[PDB]
Ligand binder design. Structure first.
Ligand SMILES: CCCCCCCCCCCCCCCCCC(=O)OC[C@H](COP(=O)([O-])OCC(O)COP(=O)([O-])OC[C@@H](COC(=O)CCCCCCCCCCCCCCCCC)OC(=O)CCCCCCCCCCCCCCCCC)OC(=O)CCCCCCCCCCCCCCCCC
Ligand SMILES: CCCCCCCCCCCCCCCCCC(=O)OC[C@H](COP(=O)([O-])OCC[N+](C)(C)C)OC(=O)CCCCCCCCCCCCCCCCC
Ligand SMILES: NC(=O)C1=CN([C@@H]2O[C@H](COP(=O)(O)OP(=O)(O)OC[C@H]3O[C@@H](n4cnc5c(N)ncnc54)[C@H](OP(=O)(O)O)[C@@H]3O)[C@@H](O)[C@H]2O)C=CC1
Ligand SMILES: CCCCCCCCCCCCCC(=O)SCCNC(=O)CCNC(=O)[C@@H](O)C(C)(C)COP(=O)(O)O
Ligand code: SF4
Ligand code: SF4
Ligand code: SF4
Ligand code: SF4
Ligand SMILES: [K+]
Ligand SMILES: [Zn+2]
Lengths: 145, 45, 96, 126, 112, 178, 342, 257, 114, 99, 207
């Protein structure tokens, strides 16, 4: 991108949702990329997310007060490029430059999915998925996350 | 609101001496030797 | 508001008090454990809610560049006031 | 006249000055680091990292900081090739575990599958 | 006629035309022992021949220094005798030979 | 261009008057008497010494002193636990452990600055996006133990509450340059 | 165990060993070595002091960033003792004097203060109490200090029934009052020994050995009420010991038989001093009291400490007292003293 | 900057030259006065250290610190000058040559100082070149070399000054060279004060220099670049350079890879 | 296979250089103990020299043996001068630190270290 | 500045130079400590138009160094050259040669 | 463009011509000649030709580089010869700078150039002290910057930032003693690498 902004107007703002105790939604910073919608339709297959409205007012989420709680539901936190869908337990605790990454495997599931444990100062801060095309591809489940 | 910034005066700053400046003073050698010899002769007498 | 542990020492705004059997109170023996009396959570709880007219309100910290980055808060929910993320200021749409 | 035959394994651990504990009782890991799943960029892959096994990081009694006892904790070493990393580990005398590079599989991508006539790939939302 | 060179440790060195002449002729005579295909021989013969030509052309010290552009004429003399020493050392060596050994493939690759 | 510092142009020959002048310079110690006069003039000048604890040395509003954590005029802490001051800290002197507060705001639980490790460079105060961490004008905070210079969040907030009447005025006088 | 007392961390000087300990004689001579070992292994050391902060300045290092907490105390202030011992797993008692002052005598120093410290430790519920008595401080001894240490040993046993009681011999080391005392005998004409230094057997013990024994006692699963005898590996006659000391000093050696009656008179004359006395009657009595054979008591060997011999760790003490002529002499220039068995 | 292929703005370059000559005066004051202190005279040390205190006050006004003023940066200059700084620099520099004259009169013609420094530590020009001195010993031995004249970097190519040249290669000639370099630094300071240009303070590239704080708090790209420059920093394209600057003590070089 | 030597063609003259260095250290130990006021004896220092040679005595590469000889000569040179102090020459003995035990029971009782 | 005329005359004569003109204590000629607020200018590339970053991206103008010869890539009458033209001799200063 | 440096293609061409000159004068040793876009000439040679290359550049008439500016080493521990020894040379006569590179490993020394430049004495002492690169025929080659009893070469990539030992005063032995290092803070490494490439001009071909 460029190094400056020519935007001299007021920015839009979108009211937040209450999608669950795992995914915190600050939807003001969503860029309307429909990645969560495509994931929840194809991989998770719940068909609960979508776009309501038109134009600059187009919003992502559920039209109703819906509790989006399935297994494999932190992967929207993974695939959301902006911080619109963040992890509620991993709320404000660490930063990626802080976190040391150890590549390990998963228990409490006999799939044995590959994960990365993000620790910091001798304390486990986050569990991210790894990439193994023969076990878990790019994502993990909610219990292991 | 015009641009305000640390700038020199429009005519520029004044002259600044930078060369070595020594006063170049003192009596001549003949005068100092003469007054020393005169003090010597007066004291001897 | 500062509180006092049953051990006796004060409790900080992030409550971290040493236990009864914790040895790390000799560092306070013959000295003091200083706690900032002005708890920011209480100080921002006692701030009034700003009544504004528009659906979207812009927040600084109170100065053009002395405040925080200028954000926008959407006051569409009538049930709850919109709080700016940097300060703790709350805004409510004056819908009358 | 200037070439001699040496059939050793190029051991320099007596010259490196490392204590024998951090030579013998140490396990290095050779690996292409995994892609950070929070981002789609892949530039942090494609270089072979050598790291050490993590030791104890305990809590400082005074301040609560993370205290450590081993010096080879932040010892990320970068290599352009797996064989180069193996040779460096063997030369310094560390036991190594090397794991293969996990390239993503090439995938068939077609935009027209989202509007299929009979297959299940037809989406319900753009 | 020159009183000082201005550089400490550099002597005044009167009659510099004869000294430059004998240094350049010695450099040429020792360059005659190099192989004909030696690029060092070819280039050093060019340099020494043109400097000897201008030292024969110009009889005045100041104008000769202006033509040579190697600082003072005593600096030129010192450079000439150092070139003679290099010619002897490069006769002892044999730098015109092919490359002794190819480097490894990633030896000069940056960044890694 | 260039100039000589000790080279002389030609010579002034030998003359009886010049020889007598040089002889008087050597025998009568004229340059030594001149140096005596110079330091005598310095004796009769006025000294530049200030009475220290009563007359302090001059400073500037940009001065980097003791660290402090500031607050909004509402009383809310300015810091939002974003950690980029410790990211830019060239001495790794800051530790910014954090968690959501009871009201859900993004605040810090541990904000430690090791003043024995800090190099007093102001990178934290020029990196902070909300003007939370500042380097106020306090420099007379020398302690008798090493531990008292290991600041925590309570100490930094106390310094911010103590020096806010001066830090705010300095930032007011300075913020248009930065 | 409470979570902050778990011994996590390799080695020492930056780790936690869970040996939170209040050391009461830390400002003296054995106390500096005990505090050094505790701070080296990495431990919370509470030092109550009554001397100047300048006099405790040498203890301000050898601890890592708040692992050493200094606090004032008074020997007549039960509140000060209680606030010293109220956060401590282990209390180590090293209070002692070689003389009697106007305020504190031998009975108070070796009985009343250890009893008060043990009582406060018991009421605060500390886990271990190590108390340093003396070897051959049994009972009915010729000197008042040894009888007082025996009575205080009984009092500490009565109040704190599981107190470890460590009885070292005459401890030698740097800035001691045994080797330096015998080396400072050179400032007079001769060496006034009782019965020419014969029929008096000593086995001095090293400071590092005693401090290592104390640290191993405060970490040891055993020693929950036991009495240890900390002695050196070799027993020497007093004459041979003083002759070895003056041989290592390279000064001279002229002994002199002096009866104990007039030697106690001279000791009282020297002890009549408002400052720290050079010697006293109790000091010469403890000098001429022979050490007992440690038969059934455990010691450094089963506390895990190898007793370093005086012939090994003697040059680091007596090299000060040499002149310039003999300053650069090694161990082999002095023949070792004859070791008796008896 | 050479690795990044960017140039600081002209106002930043002129400020960098002005404070370069200020550092040169500071360093030559320190060198001459501490050399005289080691020889045995301390009054020039006290006088020129009062002057050095004034220049440290200039540093404390232009930045935070008196000494370790992290001010000159790859993005030109961190912050602009406060409004009275140029006038106060002029007021210092118009009186400064008198102080150099006082020290010059105290030391230069003094026969004790001459006996202590003349024909002491004589370095020939060829030996200085072979030993790689390269800073002040070259021009003390007579070698006409100064990086500000031969390989100019900032606006030194458009300031005017002279390079003092020794002729005996001894301590006295080096002392004279340092005093004359102080005088020429005063000359360059006058030229910089006259020709300070009205521009911006840092290179207007937000991917290298941090933006202004107002723009950071009001703009999205500015906040993103502020965040990334103060967490990760700018990526320098790969390559190696050797950059040499005529520091007051000599050729100060950085080999950056 | 086919490397360039630095001083020694094979292991024999490398061992010869090792013996020369050991002779020099063995001769220098008494002078070091006399000059620097060391607490140790002459026997202890020579045993320490033998211990260092033994802990380096498992390498069969002539270049590595030559480099060890060179570094030993440098250390011997700064011990011949008093560039090394009492602290520097007593750092070889590790008189302060407690050695970590070699048994699994002790290494299990304290620390999670192999 | 607050010195008598006799002391000023003594100082000037003893120093050999006029001291009241250039005395090293600052009294009133310095700037006021309280200054009016500034208004710093914006530099170039604040143009809001014709200001694409790809046209002023100096950081990505850097290219890898050009190989003149290589023992691998190349696998390999004319005049002798110099790294640069020889440096012209410095001119003596005209305001003060001091030679 | 006020934010981009000028190029000076004239001095780039001059340095290219001189690189051709040196490469054809010394084909026995020169392995690579490159000129950067910053107009700096680098000549990468075989380690056997350090003495002839440095002597030619010290006193050749057209190449008078009589002043040695810098002598350093760069540890790249992924190539076979892990040390790149770099000489930065200054020509006062022609007002130029050249860079000469050679390579070494832990067991392959390089001939010292003290006979060519005397500053190379201390510079090669520093290189040996910080990287363990031995230098043949060096007078009094020894440590110059490390502690007297220091073990290991700390500027290597595999050496830790904090080292292996630390010093403290011990009152029992009354000395300054060395212990294994135990940090109370544990220096936090930061992964400050963007997963997006910044310079497409340096994009390496895939393996
Ligand atoms: C003396 C210390 C105690 C008094 C301090 C005081 O009240 O100072 C206020 C005040 C100075 O304060 P100020 O107004 O900042 O100074 C005025 C000028 O700046 C001062 O600058 P100045 O140097 O121009 O004035 C000095 C002035 C006055 O100096 C004197 O009178 C000193 C004695 C000369 C004999 O000298 C003369 O008038 C010529 C003297 C020629 C001598 C050859 O007045 C004096 O100091 C008056 C002189 C006192 C002389 C006392 C001599 C005896 C001392 C005790 C002996 C036992
Ligand atoms: C009222 C307080 C007066 C204090 C004067 C301080 C010195 C400053 C004088 C002015 C100055 O700088 O002059 C430089 C000037 C010299 O400046 P110059 O060095 O530029 O002059 C050189 C001139 N030629 C080359 C011709 C020699 O000094 C003189 O003119 C005379 C100085 C020498 C004579 C006096 C000193 C020796 C006297 C020895 C005999 C003893 C006398 C009685 C002592 C009684 C007490 C013990
Ligand atoms: N040292 C030896 O040779 C032997 C010693 N012991 C015993 O071991 C113990 C420790 O030995 P050591 O180091 O030599 O003793 P010290 O002479 O060094 O004194 C020990 C400590 O006792 C403190 N102390 C003494 N009197 C009082 C008092 N009235 N009130 C408060 N504190 C007091 C001193 O504090 P301050 O400095 O403030 O006065 C000092 O810190 C003693 O009990 C001693 O009797 C046993 C056998 C041999
Ligand atoms: C005061 C104290 C200070 C102490 C200072 C000590 C300095 C230490 C210098 C170190 C120099 C060396 O150790 S180089 C020696 C290593 N050499 C080798 O390993 C070569 C091969 N060695 C062997 O084969 C060994 O078995 C032997 C025993 C050395 C050779 O004997 P062979 O017969 O079987
Ligand atoms: S993945 Fe994130 S940015 Fe994309 S549409 Fe969903 S919430 Fe918005
Ligand atoms: S970090 Fe990314 S998602 Fe978060 S506010 Fe900034 S640009 Fe938006
Ligand atoms: S002033 Fe600099 S060193 Fe100190 S805390 Fe701030 S960023 Fe860190
Ligand atoms: S002090 Fe400022 S920069 Fe540091 S974490 Fe808080 S808000 Fe961020
Ligand atoms: K996300
Ligand atoms: Zn706000």
């Amino acid at each position: 991108g460029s190094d400056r902004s020519r935007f001299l107007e007021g920015k839009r703002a979108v009211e937040d949702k209450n999608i669950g105790p795992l995914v915190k939604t600050i939807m003001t910073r969503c860029i309307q990329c429909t990645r969560c919608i495509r994931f929840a339709s194809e991989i998770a297959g719940v068909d609960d997310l979508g776009t309501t409205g038109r134009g600059n007012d187009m919003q992502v989420g559920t039209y109703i007060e819906k509790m989006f709680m399935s297994e494999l539901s932190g992967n929207v936190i993974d695939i959301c490029p902006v911080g619109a869908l963040t992890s509620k337990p991993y709320a404000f605790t660490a930063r990626p430059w802080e976190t040391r990454k150890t590549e390990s495997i998963d228990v409490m599931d006999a799939v044995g999915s590959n994960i990365v444990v993000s620790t910091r100062t001798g304390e486990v801060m986050r569990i991210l998925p790894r990439m193994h095309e023969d076990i878990n591809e790019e994502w993990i489940s909610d219990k292991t996350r | 609101s015009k641009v305000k910034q640390d700038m020199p005066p429009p005519g520029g700053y004044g002259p600044i001496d930078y060369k070595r400046n020594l006063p170049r003073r003192g009596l001549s050698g003949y005068s100092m030797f003469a007054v020393g010899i005169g003090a010597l002769i007066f004291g001897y007498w | 508001g500062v509180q006092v542990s049953p051990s006796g020492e004060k409790i900080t705004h992030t409550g971290q008090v040493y236990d009864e059997k914790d040895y790390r109170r000799v560092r306070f023996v013959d000295r003091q454990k200083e706690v900032n009396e002005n708890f920011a959570i209480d100080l921002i709880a006692q701030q009034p809610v700003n009544e504004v007219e528009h659906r979207i309100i812009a927040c600084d910290g109170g100065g053009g560049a002395l405040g925080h980055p200028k954000v926008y808060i959407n006051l569409d929910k009538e049930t709850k006031t919109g709080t700016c993320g940097y300060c703790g200021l709350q805004f409510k749409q004056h819908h009358h | 006249t200037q070439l001699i035959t040496v059939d050793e394994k190029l051991d320099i651990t007596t010259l490196t000055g490392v204590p024998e504990e951090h030579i013998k009782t140490r396990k290095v890991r050779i690996f292409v680091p995994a892609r950070n799943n929070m981002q789609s960029g892949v530039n942090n892959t494609k270089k072979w990292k050598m790291e050490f096994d993590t030791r104890e990081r305990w809590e400082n009694p005074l301040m609560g900081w993370a205290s450590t006892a081993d010096p080879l904790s932040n010892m990320v070493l970068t290599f352009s090739a797996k064989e180069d990393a193996i040779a460096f580990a063997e030369k310094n005398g560390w036991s190594y575990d090397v794991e293969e590079k996990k390239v993503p599989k090439p995938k068939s991508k077609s935009y027209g599958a989202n509007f299929s006539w009979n297959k299940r790939t037809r989406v319900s939302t753009k | 006629l020159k009183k000082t060179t201005g550089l400490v440790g550099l002597a005044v060195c009167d009659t510099p035309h004869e000294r430059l002449t004998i240094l350049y002729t010695k450099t040429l005579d020792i360059l005659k022992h190099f192989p004909k295909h030696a690029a060092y021989r070819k280039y050093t013969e060019q340099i020494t021949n043109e400097k000897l030509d201008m030292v024969k052309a110009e009889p005045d010290v100041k104008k000769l220094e202006a033509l040579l552009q190697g600082g003072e004429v005593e600096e030129v003399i010192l450079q000439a005798e150092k070139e003679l020493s290099l010619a002897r050392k490069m006769l002892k060596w044999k730098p015109w030979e092919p490359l002794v050994e190819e480097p490894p493939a990633n030896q000069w690759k940056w960044p890694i | 261009t260039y100039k000589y510092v000790n080279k002389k142009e030609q010579e002034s020959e030998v003359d009886m008057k010049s020889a007598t002048d040089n002889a008087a310079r050597i025998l009568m110690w004229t340059e030594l008497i001149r140096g005596l006069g110079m330091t005598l003039s310095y004796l009769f000048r006025e000294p530049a010494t200030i009475n220290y604890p009563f007359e302090k040395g001059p400073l500037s509003p940009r001065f980097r002193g003791e660290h402090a954590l500031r607050r909004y005029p509402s009383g809310e802490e300015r810091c939002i636990a974003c950690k980029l001051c410790e990211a830019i800290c060239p001495a790794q002197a800051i530790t910014i452990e954090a968690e959501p507060r009871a009201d859900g705001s993004r605040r810090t639980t541990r904000y430690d600055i090791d003043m024995t490790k800090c190099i007093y460079c102001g990178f934290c105060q020029e990196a902070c996006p909300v003007d939370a961490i500042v380097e106020g004008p306090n420099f007379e905070f020398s302690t008798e133990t090493h531990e008292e210079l290991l600041y925590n969040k309570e100490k930094l907030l106390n310094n911010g509450d103590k020096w806010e009447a001066e830090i705010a005025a300095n930032i007011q006088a300075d913020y248009l340059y930065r | 165990l409470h979570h902050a007392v778990i011994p996590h961390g390799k080695g020492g000087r930056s780790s936690v060993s869970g040996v939170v300990a209040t050391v009461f004689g830390a400002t003296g001579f054995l106390g500096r070595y005990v505090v050094n070992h505790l701070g080296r292994m990495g431990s919370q050391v509470i030092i109550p002091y009554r001397c100047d902060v300048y006099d405790i300045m040498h203890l301000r290092l050898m601890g890592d960033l708040g692992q050493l907490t200094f606090l004032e105390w008074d020997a007549r202030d039960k509140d000060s003792i209680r606030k010293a011992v109220q956060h401590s797993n282990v209390v180590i008692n090293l209070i002692g004097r070689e003389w009697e002052t106007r305020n504190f005598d031998f009975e108070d120093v070796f009985v009343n203060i250890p009893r008060a410290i043990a009582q406060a430790s018991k009421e605060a519920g500390v886990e271990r109490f190590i108390h340093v008595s003396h070897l051959n401080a049994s009972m009915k001894s010729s000197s008042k200090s040894l009888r007082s240490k025996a009575v205080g040993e009984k009092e500490v046993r009565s109040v704190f029934p599981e107190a470890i009681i460590i009885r070292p011999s005459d401890i030698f080391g740097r800035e001691d009052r045994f080797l330096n005392h015998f080396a400072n005998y050179r400032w007079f004409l001769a060496v006034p020994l009782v019965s020419l230094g014969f029929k008096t057997v000593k086995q001095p013990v090293y400071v590092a050995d005693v401090s290592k024994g104390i640290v191993n006692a405060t970490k040891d699963p055993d020693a929950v009420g036991k009495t240890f005898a900390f002695t050196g590996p070799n027993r020497y006659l007093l004459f041979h010991l003083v002759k070895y000391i003056f041989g290592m000093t390279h000064r001279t050696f002229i002994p002199y038989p002096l009866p104990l009656f007039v030697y106690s008179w001279i000791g009282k004359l020297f002890g009549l001093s408002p400052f720290e006395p050079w010697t006293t009657k109790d000091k010469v009595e403890r000098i001429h009291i022979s050490d007992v054979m440690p038969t059934d008591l455990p010691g450094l060997e089963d506390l895990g400490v190898q007793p370093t011999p005086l012939e090994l760790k003697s040059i680091e003490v007596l090299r000060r007292h040499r002149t310039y002529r003999w300053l650069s002499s090694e161990i082999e220039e002095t023949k070792p003293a004859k070791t008796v068995n008896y | 900057e050479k690795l990044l292929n960017i140039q600081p703005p002209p106002r930043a370059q002129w400020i960098r030259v002005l404070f370069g000559e200020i550092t040169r005066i500071l360093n030559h004051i320190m060198a001459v006065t501490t050399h005289a202190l080691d020889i045995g005279a301390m009054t020039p040390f006290f006088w020129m250290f009062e002057e050095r205190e004034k220049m440290f006050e200039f540093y404390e006004r232009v930045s935070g610190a008196r000494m370790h003023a992290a001010y000159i940066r790859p993005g030109g200059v961190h912050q602009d000058l406060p409004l009275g700084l140029l006038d106060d620099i002029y007021e210092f520099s118009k009186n400064f040559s008198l102080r150099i004259d006082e020290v010059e009169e105290m030391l230069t013609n003094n026969r004790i100082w001459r006996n202590r420094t003349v024909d002491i530590g004589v370095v020939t020009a060829e030996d200085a070149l072979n030993y790689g001195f390269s800073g002040v010993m070259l021009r003390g031995s007579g070698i006409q070399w100064d990086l500000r004249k031969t390989q100019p970097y900032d606006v030194y190519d458009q300031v005017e000054f002279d390079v003092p040249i020794g002729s005996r290669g001894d301590c006295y000639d080096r002392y004279l060279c340092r005093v004359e370099e102080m005088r020429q630094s005063l000359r360059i300071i006058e030229q910089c004060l006259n020709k300070m240009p009205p521009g911006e303070i840092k290179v207007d590239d937000a991917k290298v220099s941090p933006p202004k704080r107002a723009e950071m708090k009001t703009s999205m790209e500015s906040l993103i670049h502020h965040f990334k420059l103060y967490t990760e920093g700018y990526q320098v394209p790969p390559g190696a350079t050797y950059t040499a600057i005529e520091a007051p003590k000599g050729e100060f070089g950085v080999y950056l890879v | 296979t086919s490397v360039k030597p630095i001083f020694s063609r094979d292991l024999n003259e490398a061992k010869r250089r090792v013996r020369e260095l050991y002779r020099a250290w063995y001769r220098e130990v008494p002078n070091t103990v006399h000059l620097m006021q060391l607490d140790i004896t002459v026997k202890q220092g020579r045993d320490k020299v033998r211990e260092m040679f033994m802990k380096n005595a498992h390498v069969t590469d002539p270049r590595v043996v030559d480099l060890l000889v060179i570094k030993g000569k440098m250390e011997l040179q700064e011990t011949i001068k008093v560039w090394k102090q009492r602290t520097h020459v007593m750092r070889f003995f590790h008189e302060t630190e407690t050695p970590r035990p070699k048994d699994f029971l002790s290494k299990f009782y304290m620390g999670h270290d192999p | 500045a607050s010195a008598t005329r006799v002391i000023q005359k003594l100082r000037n004569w003893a120093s050999g130079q006029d001291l009241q003109a250039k005395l090293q204590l600052r009294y009133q000629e310095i700037a006021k400590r309280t200054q009016p607020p500034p208004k710093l200018p914006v530099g170039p590339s604040h143009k809001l138009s014709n200001n694409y970053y790809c046209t002023r991206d100096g950081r990505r103008e850097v290219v890898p160094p050009s190989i003149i010869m290589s023992s691998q890539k190349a696998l390999v009458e004319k005049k002798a050259v110099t790294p640069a033209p020889p440096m012209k001799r410095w001119e003596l200063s005209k305001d003060q040669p001091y030679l | 463009r006020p934010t981009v440096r000028p190029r000076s293609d004239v001095t780039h061409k001059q340095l290219s011509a001189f690189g051709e000159y040196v490469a054809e004068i010394l084909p026995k040793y020169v392995q690579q000649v490159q000129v950067s876009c910053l107009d700096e000439l680098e000549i990468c040679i075989h380690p056997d030709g350090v003495i002839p290359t440095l002597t030619f550049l010290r006193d050749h008439t057209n190449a008078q580089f009589k002043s040695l500016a810098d002598l350093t080493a760069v540890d790249v521990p992924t190539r076979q010869n892990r040390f790149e020894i770099v000489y930065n040379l200054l020509s006062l006569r022609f007002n130029s700078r050249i860079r000469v590179k050679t390579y070494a490993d832990e067991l392959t020394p390089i001939d010292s150039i003290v006979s060519v430049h005397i500053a190379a004495n201390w510079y090669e002492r520093e290189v040996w002290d910080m990287f363990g690169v031995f230098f043949f025929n060096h007078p009094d080659l020894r440590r110059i910057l490390t502690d007297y009893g220091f073990e290991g070469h700390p500027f290597r990539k595999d050496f830790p930032l904090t080292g292996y030992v630390e010093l403290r005063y011990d009152d029992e032995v009354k000395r300054v003693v060395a212990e294994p290092v135990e940090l109370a803070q544990e220096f936090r490494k930061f992964d400050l690498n963007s997963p997006w490439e910044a310079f497409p001009a340096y994009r390496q071909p895939p393996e």
